[PDB]
Amino acid sequence: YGIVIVSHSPEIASGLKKLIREVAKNISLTAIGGLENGEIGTSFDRVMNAIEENEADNLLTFFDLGSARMNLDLVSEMTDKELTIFNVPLIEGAYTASALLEAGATFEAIKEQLEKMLIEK
């Protein structure tokens, strides 16, 4: 298993990975934000790359805004890696998944917790 974070912002992505590294030092964790030029936005090529870059083959994925989700969904149809796209808060949801995964909770247990926090994005 692995965790992928997708944001419109390079700084959110970087800040969130650092916050999470405090509670999940050992997990496969990829965090990407913004465009190639570092401006606010979501690059499909970066999302695609970040799914390839993560070492795991089953990916728990998190996004901020609807367009980020769509990139994740596009990429999902374009790899054999198993992606789950969690329609949950980026910070709170990715933090929860990462902490649980570090502590050795199962995929099903993580999904059960994340189902509790579903939002209308």
Partner: protein
């Protein structure tokens, strides 16, 4: 039906409309978005026209796939994935048929699958659906496309960035609906 040549003509014409109207499209994306729809599309379509100059396509399907993959890569908001999926589905359809209504059908279907929107939610879906019914009923026209653009102002946005404004999205024309109008009016120019 579109050919290799009228497809390239269409897309060049579409690009021209986007470049000329990029500021207005971003302006529309102000009160109900992050003010970038014009710049996303302008970026996406100049890159698409660059991509079409350096290739020698053997069919219309091949052109659509190239468009699909360029817009996916080079349009950087919600509109990229949606137009991208639209053209990708159209690419697959173009292998069997170049009937315009069947292409728009496949495009509309992929957009709805990608963004999950239904007609009436203040998105480009609204005009893809209307344009399709227009082609099917042999009544497609520029005036019928502006009809739907203008009609988007009074719809409540329940999808995309616009949806975060709730009722504050009423009174505002959807930028995606406007860019899809340019797409379709330039298509009607060249398809006959």
């Amino acid at each position: 039906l579109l050919t290799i040549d009228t497809t390239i003509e269409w897309l060049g014409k579409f690009n021209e409309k986007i470049q000329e109207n990029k500021a207005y499209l971003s302006e529309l994306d102000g009160p109900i978005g992050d003010g970038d729809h014009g710049a996303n599309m302008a970026r996406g379509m100049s890159e698409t026209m660059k991509a079409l100059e350096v290739s020698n396509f053997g069919n219309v399907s091949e052109i659509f796939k190239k468009v699909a993959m360029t817009l996916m890569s080079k349009v950087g908001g919600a509109s990229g994935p949606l137009y991208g999926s639209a053209f990708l589905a159209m690419s697959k359809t173009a292998i069997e048929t170049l009937d315009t209504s069947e292409l728009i059908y496949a495009g509309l279907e992929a957009i709805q699958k990608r963004g999950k929107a239904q007609v009436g939610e203040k998105t480009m879906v609204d005009i893809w659906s209307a344009f399709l019914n227009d082609l099917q009923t042999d009544s497609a026209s520029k005036d019928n496309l502006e009809k739907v653009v203008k009609a988007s102002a009074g719809l409540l946005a329940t999808k995309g960035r616009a949806s975060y404004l709730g009722e504050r999205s009423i009174g505002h024309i959807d930028p995606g609906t406007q860019s899809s109008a340019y797409l379709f009016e330039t298509l009607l120019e060249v398809v006959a």
